[PDB]
Amino acid sequence: RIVGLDQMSASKTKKGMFRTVGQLYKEQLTKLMTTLRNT
Amino acid sequence: LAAKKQELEEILHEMEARIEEEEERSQQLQA
Amino acid sequence: LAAKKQELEEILHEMEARIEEEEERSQQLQA
Amino acid sequence: NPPGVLALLDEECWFPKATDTSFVEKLIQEQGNHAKFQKSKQLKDKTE
C-alpha cells in the first residue's frame, strides 16, 4: 500500500509522491480517447 | 530483457524517490 | 542486464540507508 | 473552478479528519449555486 500512518486517519505522510486513490481509470479513458482520435 | 525493462522503471521510480527524499530532508533541516 | 542489475541492488541499498538516516535526522534534530 | 464530484473526492480522501456527512454537506454547499444538479430536499438521507 501507499505510505501512510495506521493504514488499514491523521496520517501526515508526503503529498503527491505515489499513485493516487483512483483517477488512473480516468486517464486511461482519456488515453483511449487519444487512441480513437485517428481512424 | 522485459524483466530488465521493468527493473528500469523501478530504477526511475527510485530516482524520483531520491529527489523527493532529498527535498523532504531539506525541508526538515529548515525546521 | 548484469550491470543494470548490480545498479539495481546498489540503488536499493542506498535508498534504504538514505531514507533511514534521513528519518532519524528529521524526527530527532527537527526539534 | 469549484471542483466536480471526482475532484472533490480527490481532495476529500487526503484530509486527515473527514467523514461522509461533512463531505456531503460541503459538496451541497459548494455546488448549490450551480443549476445543473437537480435536488429534492425531502430526502435528507444523502440521496441527492
Side-chain angles (χ1 to χ4, degrees):
Chain A
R1 204 186 186 176
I2 304 312
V3 60
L5 275 66
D6 68 4
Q7 294 316 309
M8 289 213 62
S9 281
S11 64
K12 203 211 171 305
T13 45
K14 200 180 283 267
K15 169 87 168 78
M17 177 157 177
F18 272 101
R19 67 188 182 265
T20 303
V21 175
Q23 303 89 31
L24 73 165
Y25 198 64
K26 189 267 291 183
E27 59 86 19
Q28 195 55 261
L29 302 177
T30 64
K31 192 263 158 188
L32 191 50
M33 292 177 72
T34 64
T35 304
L36 273 296
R37 293 292 86 193
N38 192 31
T39 186
Chain B
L1 194 153
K4 186 32 75 187
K5 281 182 175 178
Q6 55 83 25
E7 293 179 353
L8 295 174
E9 292 84 4
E10 292 306 315
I11 303 301
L12 305 190
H13 208 82
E14 269 191 315
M15 81 76 68
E16 281 312 311
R18 185 182 295 276
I19 310 163
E20 291 149 345
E21 80 183 332
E22 290 329 291
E23 293 148 358
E24 177 266 353
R25 186 62 206 95
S26 51
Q27 278 135 19
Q28 299 323 291
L29 167 66
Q30 293 141 30
Chain C
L1 190 144
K4 295 173 183 178
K5 281 194 299 182
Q6 302 175 359
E7 183 68 22
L8 180 77
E9 290 91 7
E10 291 179 353
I11 294 169
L12 266 294
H13 313 140
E14 273 171 322
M15 186 66 204
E16 297 157 349
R18 170 66 175 130
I19 202 155
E20 201 71 23
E21 61 201 74
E22 66 183 1
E23 85 175 20
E24 286 88 6
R25 284 162 142 205
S26 298
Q27 267 82 18
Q28 268 85 23
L29 315 164
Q30 86 176 78
Chain D
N1 295 115
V5 176
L6 180 46
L8 201 73
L9 270 300
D10 291 6
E11 289 91 7
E12 263 304 317
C13 66
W14 216 263
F15 278 99
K17 175 262 166 188
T19 178
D20 46 357
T21 186
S22 73
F23 150 75
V24 165
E25 299 144 358
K26 172 176 181 184
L27 182 47
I28 294 160
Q29 291 332 290
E30 293 177 350
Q31 309 294 126
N33 47 356
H34 296 88
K36 274 74 64 181
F37 316 132
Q38 303 326 289
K39 279 142 178 46
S40 301
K41 284 303 142 62
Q42 75 284 331
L43 305 176
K44 293 182 183 293
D45 302 331
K46 277 74 69 178
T47 56
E48 281 294 347

